[PDB]
Amino acid sequence: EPPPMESPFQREDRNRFDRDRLFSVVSRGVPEELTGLLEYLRWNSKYLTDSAYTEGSTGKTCLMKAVLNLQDGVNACIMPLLQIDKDSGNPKLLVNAQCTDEFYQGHSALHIAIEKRSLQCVKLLVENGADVHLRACGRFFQKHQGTCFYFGELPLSLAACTKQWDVVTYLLENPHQPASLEATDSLGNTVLHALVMIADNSPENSALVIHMYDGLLQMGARLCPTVQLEEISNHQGLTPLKLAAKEGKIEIFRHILQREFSGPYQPLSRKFTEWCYGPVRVSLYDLSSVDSWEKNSVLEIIAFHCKSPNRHRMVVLEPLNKLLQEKWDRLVSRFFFNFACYLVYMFIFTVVAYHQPSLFGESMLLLGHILILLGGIYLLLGQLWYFWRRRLFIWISFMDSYFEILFLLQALLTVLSQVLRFMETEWYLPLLVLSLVLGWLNLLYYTRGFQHTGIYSVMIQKVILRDLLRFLLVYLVFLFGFAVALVSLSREARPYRSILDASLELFKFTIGMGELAFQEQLRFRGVVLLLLLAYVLLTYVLLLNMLIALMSETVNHVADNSWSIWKLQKAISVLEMENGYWWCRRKKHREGRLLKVGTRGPDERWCFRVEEVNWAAWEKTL
Amino acid sequence: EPPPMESPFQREDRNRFDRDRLFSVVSRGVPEELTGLLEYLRWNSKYLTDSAYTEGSTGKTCLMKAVLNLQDGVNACIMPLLQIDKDSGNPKLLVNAQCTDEFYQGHSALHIAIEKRSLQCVKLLVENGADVHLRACGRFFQKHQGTCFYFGELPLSLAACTKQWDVVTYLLENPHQPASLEATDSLGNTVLHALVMIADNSPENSALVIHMYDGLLQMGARLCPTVQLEEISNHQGLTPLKLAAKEGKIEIFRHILQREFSGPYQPLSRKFTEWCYGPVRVSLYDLSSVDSWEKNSVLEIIAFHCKSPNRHRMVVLEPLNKLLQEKWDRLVSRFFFNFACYLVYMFIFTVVAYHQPSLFGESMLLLGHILILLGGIYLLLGQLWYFWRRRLFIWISFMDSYFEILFLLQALLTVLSQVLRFMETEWYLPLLVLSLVLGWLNLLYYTRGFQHTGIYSVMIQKVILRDLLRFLLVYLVFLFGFAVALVSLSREARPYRSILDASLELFKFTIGMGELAFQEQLRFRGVVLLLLLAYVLLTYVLLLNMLIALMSETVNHVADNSWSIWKLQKAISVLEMENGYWWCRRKKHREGRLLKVGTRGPDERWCFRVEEVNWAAWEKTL
Ligand SMILES: CCCCCCCCCC(=O)OC[C@H](COP(=O)([O-])OCCN)OC(=O)CCCCCCCCC
Ligand SMILES: CCCCCCCCCC(=O)OC[C@H](COP(=O)([O-])OCCN)OC(=O)CCCCCCCCC
Ligand SMILES: CCCCCCCCCC(=O)OC[C@H](COP(=O)([O-])OCCN)OC(=O)CCCCCCCCC
Ligand SMILES: CCCCCCCCCC(=O)OC[C@H](COP(=O)([O-])OCCN)OC(=O)CCCCCCCCC
Hints:
This is part of a larger assembly, with 2 copies of chain A (622 residues).
Chain A: H1 19-28, H2 37-44, H3 62-68, H4 78-87, H5 109-115, H6 119-126, H7 155-161, H8 165-172, H9 191-197, H10 203-223, H11 240-246, H12 250-257, E1 271-277, E2 280-286, H13 298-304, H14 311-315, H15 320-354, H16 361-389, H17 398-422, H18 428-440, H19 451-459, H20 465-468, H21 471-489, H22 499-507, H23 526-554, H24 562-577, E3 593-598, E4 603-613, H25 615-620
Helix pairs in contact in A: 1-3, 5-6, 7-8, 7-9, 11-12, 13-24, 15-16, 15-18, 15-24, 16-17, 17-18, 19-24, 21-22, 21-23
The structure holds 1,2-didecanoyl-SN-glycero-3-phosphoethanolamine (PEX) (4 copies).
PDB class: transport protein
Keywords: Ion channel, TRP channel, Membrane protein, tetramer, transport protein
Entry title: Apo rat TRPV2 in nanodiscs, state 1
């Protein structure tokens, strides 16, 4: 168990001016009783950095203890404690000391000074030589489940994540050791990545992150105008725009994608108003990192690399709405050509399976078996090529990619049935029939091409599968227990001869075909009737409970988001159709126009023109 | 693709003082560097109007570029640019120049000056001879789907639609070229039509339209008192009151229909308060264009020419509520006489079809066949006369006029069955039986005569048909795929012999009569049982999804509008019953009384007296 960072009740473990007297001095704050420590350290040839004066488990020095105990942001023992350290000839420094444990690794006194919101204590460390790039890489400072606080591991990133502009302003320009806006942590995250990382979708945190993101980006142009702070990638190869898309942060992603500035800081904009006429506003949006022409775009990340529930809200944002709409209109002919190629494949599949012989017409049947075999191999190779490129997509989006599983399973059992027809066995017919079911159920993937059938295919999957799958467990307990009961009691002659037959007769009560009768060919005829009556009452109550719960969870008056999920379904279809087939790869067509927008700190960007009509917003500006 | 109207990033296409130097001068605004253009134009004998100085795709001149770039509503290059144009001897003028493309056709500099809300630039063009009746008839300025802005194509209509009273006041009375309130566009729409056309049903736009409608109507009496601005019809023959009814604009239609003024502008009122006593207010409403005595009234337009979802909210407004109520009371005897004539027609239809011979009593049967034949011809001629006069009603109101289709189809198969009885064939009996079904289902049209059965017949059609019709598509895929599966697997002897028989046995599971058993006369008996079990589970889940979605879309706590839809159902019945039959045409009875209301700018109008009791509104006035 990790020890506490600061405790006025539990003393630090150990794993004349000793440590216990020293730590009590800096806690109380009076510096006059620090006399005698400098002479004691020179006599024993010891330093304040060594393990005798720090906490054994972590390495918390006396300067960290003094900073952890501040009165109105100032502690009178902080300034003189560095004087004993400097005058003792320490090869290390107390200001650059860090904890060495697994939980608070790299925690420094500058991090605690920034967290205490004491600008005076932050300044006092820098004038005495505090490194402003010291890293807190302990498990408390990583983002995980449980008790943690991720802020970007840097003093400048900590000041930005805690909303302290005076610390940020002092750390960026100071004549002793200025902080770099280009600094990174173990994840490769800069201060712009860290502001994305701390953000949830609440309005208050979103206002905090957006205000700090814009301010840091503007001060980046004043200090280091020759460096694009937005285009720095981490160790996972993600820009802050790409990192917001992967982690599903709806507010900071929308603000960066539609960033608008005027006058000064105008090259820091991704949106450019072009002309306005009444309720019509026409804008130009930057397609850098957004267009799917290049590798690992925002579109590819949202469609296949994001786990967040609000992926359908990122896809309907601007310019992602119009960019994918024009891409859909160029591929709607290819989508329906693929739909026509699957109708012919299943028209042949249905005709051949309908004319299967017992265990010209024979030549037409042999040609049909070849087309099924070649069609199965073509579908098998395409889906295997899909999972080789989309390896992590099916493990996070089973409710969004199960047709890729079903197309794979239908293709495998199609080929396997033809193998079981070459080597003559009876089992090829159940496999060919079951592939006839799975392929016909695969036509419903193509209902997303039309908006009408597409939004209907979204409203039907309201959250019913994993209620009905732990509905199954209680059901199967009721069914199995009553089934093994009925078989044992029916053995006495003076109906139910197996577990499977009794289970089928009990399942018939939920389809409206349950036989309820007073059988006279059984000794125990009252008790069987009471067991059947008890099962019917228990099942009807339990089915009634399941409706009542499904209605409490699904009729909620929350706005119907079936339009957005349908747009996400097309965006997956477009981004896969833009890669072509496995045998033929389509070339990538870039979107937008190369336009000059000003001067870089010329400034040529690939801009997408968006025409938007909004009568509501225009009337409020009158 | 149309080029942008104004772009600081994309230069205008081309489809010494050249165009590129000239367009940069008027964009920046300094007029001192315009020197040399007048001498250059006289040397080359060129003008500013020609295509060398305008955009090739559209025809955007330099004056349009100068107006598109205004600083605080004024550009210093606008006034001197007209001096080079005037001094060069141009047969045309730069102020009356218009774009020639398909998208911005007829766009002038006066339109941009009004849209920029610069009264100084609007004035400066008129003193130099800007035509105030120039027309913007391009596709951007027509009302359609996509990016557009319809305002009435006129400078006065543009100023009225953008809420600029100072531009409207200046354009109507100016000593150079005043604007006419009687001016029209290609649709025939005046400024009063255009204010109706731009209005949606939001409260903010409705307040904007009503305020501009009343103000323009009052200034019409001051400027041109001898012209009725409200009675001008467009090329579709619609007054602004009629145009609001056809496009379903609930707010501006109610305000015009119940317009009340006092003192001055009192002849501009359609409602006149007659006497008040406590909570009782008695008013007189103008029946001009409203009463169905004349052709193409508001009642005829609302019932048969409107596509808007809120047609039932226009019919319950005043005086439309009391006018149709008194018309219903004069026709409720004719409605029930028509109901009694259809009961006798179907009492004969049921008796004759019940006594059909094999393939006095014979004379009574022959008389019954004649009455069915004559009754079928009478119903066929009436419905064919209906669709000759109501040609566009059945194509926009299928959920409101399908009984006219069903009465037509029942009459056709009635006559066709008698034809197939004259030429002796066996197929007349299925047609006569199916006409017996369709005629009995046609009695439910007459349930709207009673309020009780009428409002019930409205609550039952909550929106369930087109959910259950794209519910059908997924269903039919499940049913057909499992049906062709079961037939193929049942061919091995050691049930389901056709697609139709298997489809019927699978459909029986949704009516509670599905047979689930372990058949021992089939080789593949486990796999058939698993296929049946999979079909039952898939169908039950999918039926459960359809209930959950129907309940999420229909129990919404929105107020029940079944009373208003029932009133719209009677209004269609009254307006069709007022035309009489096809053989006999009833004369039209005018409503209201001819009363003098003042002096026209005597003033005799056909006024409808409405007595209204409202205790709630009276108590707030105390
Ligand atoms: C190898 C070079 C020759 C190629 C042969 C011609 C193939 C045409 C390409 C094609 O249209 O395939 C469409 C379809 C793929 O479905 P999907 O991957 O889009 O959907 C995936 C969803 N997860 O594939 C099918 O539906 C089955 C294709 C086999 C039958 C072809 C019949 C042709 C009729 C003209
Ligand atoms: C291993 C064998 C498994 C066989 C399972 C066969 C299931 C077929 C898939 C199916 O039911 O059709 C899905 C259809 C459209 O879904 P979608 O494209 O919107 O979605 C695609 C991306 N989400 O929408 C529906 O019809 C759903 C209504 C029925 C639900 C049945 C639940 C299936 C599990 C019991
Ligand atoms: C040609 C000159 C002689 C005319 C013959 C007498 C016809 C009376 C007119 C009449 O009442 O017709 C009522 C009904 C029409 O229904 P609908 O158009 O109102 O509803 C239309 C809704 N879409 O029509 C019927 O129900 C069927 C009429 C045929 C049987 C008449 C039986 C008479 C019993 C007294
Ligand atoms: C080509 C052959 C087609 C035969 C279709 C037969 C349908 C008969 C019409 C009917 O069902 O009765 C309608 C009844 C009253 O409707 P309405 O007068 O309020 O409305 C008149 C103006 N809206 O209200 C109801 O009873 C509705 C409840 C049943 C709905 C059945 C849906 C029919 C399609 C499957």
